[PDB]
Design a binder for this molecule. Structure first.
Ligand SMILES: [Zn+2]
Ligand SMILES: [Zn+2]
Ligand SMILES: [Zn+2]
Length: 92
């Protein structure tokens, strides 16, 4: 079990989420923004373009795997793991 201190906490007033760091919540709020006319039914994915959406939707194939560190989503699982060892890591 992790053992450390904790002053304050950052809670998201959108999806009742929580983030240890601040920058995490800020960048996260990104998905919590609807300024485009075309919105995605699956997620909060929106784009002024029409095609972009059509292609995006295709991405939704059952269940995606979101990164524990960042908000990176991948179709496969194994890839996600490597993404954390390559992106969130620079040591073989
Ligand atoms: Zn949120
Ligand atoms: Zn979507
Ligand atoms: Zn990641």
């Amino acid at each position: 079990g992790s053992s450390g201190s904790s002053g304050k906490i950052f809670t998201c007033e959108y999806c009742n989420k929580v983030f240890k760091f601040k920058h995490s919540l800020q960048a996260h709020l990104r998905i919590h923004t609807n300024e485009k006319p075309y919105k995605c039914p699956q997620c909060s994915y929106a784009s002024a373009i029409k095609a972009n959406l059509n292609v995006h939707l295709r991405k939704h194939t059952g269940e995606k795997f979101a990164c524990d560190y960042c908000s990176f989503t991948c179709l496969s699982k194994g890839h996600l793991k490597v993404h954390i060892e390559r992106v969130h890591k620079k040591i073989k």
